[PDB]
Design a protein around this ligand. Structure first.
Ligand code: HEM
Ligand code: HEM
Ligand code: HEM
Ligand code: HEM
Lengths: 141, 146, 141, 146
């Protein structure tokens, strides 16, 4: 749902992310891959090694995908509509795998924003990403 | 809990720094705040209405402290986690009746707290290192569920 | 989301349920309680024994709640809006617990409708109940 | 897998009837149909586009058959499920890389199939009896994940 209180947090916690947005998007990934190995099976064509420009590039891609979502929160389903098909249909990503990346997306934010990642804002994002992951596995329900 | 010796040093060196006092409650609290349904097991702790009330609550810092004792404990008994947590298991299981899914969440917030306090030192390899531990602990407690 | 193909199944699989609706609602519960014990902690005031009229009565209640949802599918969020608060706020039901009851709701349908519970309709309902459970744990996201 | 002796008779008497041939594929198929992401491990099985194509697919009935062999197997080795499934574990884990959550789903569809075929005989006590088994099997396979 996202109370106007959450979307403000999200919107305030993300602005602080700024241009680092794409870097954090690549850091989250690396985290997911090292932490939850079973996710590497989706990225065979990727060189999941530490400096991997591919992982760097998709990190930017994932970053922008969320930005699109923040700046269009009061209507995520229409915005990420596309991505849903792409992940739900073509790629067939196990829904679980979204809960993991969502975890590593916060583990990355928290290790970068020590002043904003308060318990309240921590929950806002968890909610945000939960909705983002709902939308993407929507073409499943 | 296998844990390559290099993942051991990662987990080892980091832990010894942890403010074993504050960190405990920092986790449990955020659990109650970010996963509201958890709160159904600590009504007895007092006001848990706002986040500010949960993070200021003395019952919470006192319990999270213990909860971290269980970690530090299991963290120095990986070799056998089930036995270490045999008692706690039964308690959380056939007594409190807490869904094992919640032992993964708590472990997951703990990993966020640890990321919050060590920011950049908490590298991706050190995260996946703790991620093994959290599942390891998270499973030993769900044992009695068989 | 629910493709018009699903809502037809759901609508067709449920009509066959008819007046037994409330009986199946009470059977599902019994199934959840015996299968997943950790759910009995929500119902202390209930006499979860086999013939329990309470479990019978709430079985009717849960039944009608879904019916309300079938006959108002293209708008579940507004309909069950109330129930959301009641479960998400007052009762604080662990979200997991919805995946379980949803399971026992199908295990009950399948043991009652051997002609309609085809793989296709099986998926429709799974989707339906997934949306029903999303809505209720909406006041969480 | 504890299993009171009365839960044993429930699981025992019911199983021996199961069309160990058809039932296997009936489960696996519905898994691919109701949980689409699973299909990502059987692209090699041929057309899995419609449900009708998945339930008519010879590769599916041939695999589900085996999959049920693993059940019947573990069903007569509850005493030690980990060992029984030690090999399969490693395979599904550090080889196929299948998320343990999926071993609960499959077990759960199996329980739906069993409800479909025995309708009213599959009483609530007999369901909770199998529900223990499904988790039991579901965990032995997720073992190698530590
Ligand atoms: C937080 C949710 C997610 C978002 C925001 C996200 C976003 C995206 C975006 C933007 C693209 C690239 C689209 C393009 O430029 O064509 C994409 C591709 C892809 N995503 Fe994700 N993704 C998410 C989660 C995941 C997860 C859970 C996995 C798997 C573990 C995953 C696997 C893929 C794969 C394999 C591709 C195609 C990669 C390629 O061929 O370059 N994504 N995703
Ligand atoms: C890594 C996981 C966890 C650890 C290590 C842990 C550890 C502990 C310990 C050390 C105790 C108290 C024993 C004593 O006072 O002597 C305890 C008690 C308890 N735990 Fe946990 N716990 C975990 C997860 C959870 C979760 C997720 C919940 C449920 C939402 C929970 C709810 C409880 C409750 C309510 C008690 C309270 C006992 C009292 O009233 O004093 N714990 N736990
Ligand atoms: C399929 C989703 C669910 C639906 C359709 C459903 C529907 C309802 C309805 C209709 C009521 C009664 C409202 C009234 O007459 O005041 C209710 C009450 C309640 N529900 Fe559910 N419920 C669902 C899942 C659950 C789950 C997962 C649990 C817990 C395991 C649960 C626990 C409760 C409790 C404790 C009450 C209050 C009981 C009482 O005091 O009589 N429900 N629910
Ligand atoms: C109760 C759980 C399960 C049981 C008992 C089971 C059992 C088995 C058995 C008996 C084999 C084949 C060994 C052989 O051919 O000699 C096997 C292989 C395999 N399993 Fe499972 N399985 C389970 C869950 C799953 C799930 C949930 C998936 C993943 C979505 C899966 C994917 C595979 C795959 C793809 C192979 C194929 C091997 C080939 O290409 O021939 N299984 N499983």
């Amino acid at each position: 749902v996202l109370s106007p209180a959450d979307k403000t947090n999200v919107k305030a916690a993300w602005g602080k992310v700024g241009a680092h947005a794409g870097e954090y998007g690549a850091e989250a990934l690396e985290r997911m891959f090292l932490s939850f190995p079973t996710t590497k099976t989706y990225f065979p064509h990727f060189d999941l090694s530490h400096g991997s420009a591919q992982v760097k590039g998709h990190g930017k891609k994932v970053a922008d995908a969320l930005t699109n979502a923040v700046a269009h929160v009061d209507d995520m389903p229409n915005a990420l509509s596309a991505l849903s098909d792409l992940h739900a249909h073509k790629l067939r990503v196990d829904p679980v795998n979204f809960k993991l990346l969502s975890h590593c997306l916060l583990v990355t934010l928290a290790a970068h924003l020590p002043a904003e990642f308060t318990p309240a804002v921590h929950a806002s994002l968890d909610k945000f990403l939960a909705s983002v992951s709902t939308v993407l596995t929507s073409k499943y329900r | 809990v296998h844990l390559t010796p290099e993942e051991k040093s990662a987990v080892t060196a980091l832990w010894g720094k942890v403010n074993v006092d504050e960190v405990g409650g920092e986790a449990l609290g955020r659990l109650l705040v970010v996963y509201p349904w958890t709160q159904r097991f600590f009504e007895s702790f007092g006001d848990l209405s706002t986040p500010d009330a949960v993070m200021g609550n003395p019952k919470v810092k006192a319990h999270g402290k213990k909860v971290l004792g269980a970690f530090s404990d299991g963290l120095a008994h990986l070799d056998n986690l089930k036995g270490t947590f045999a008692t706690l298991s039964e308690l959380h299981c056939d007594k409190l009746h807490v869904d094992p899914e919640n032992f993964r969440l708590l472990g997951n917030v703990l990993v966020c707290v640890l990321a919050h306090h060590f920011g950049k030192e908490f590298t991706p390899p050190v995260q996946a290192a703790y991620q093994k531990v959290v599942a390891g602990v998270a499973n030993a407690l769900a044992h009695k569920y068989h």
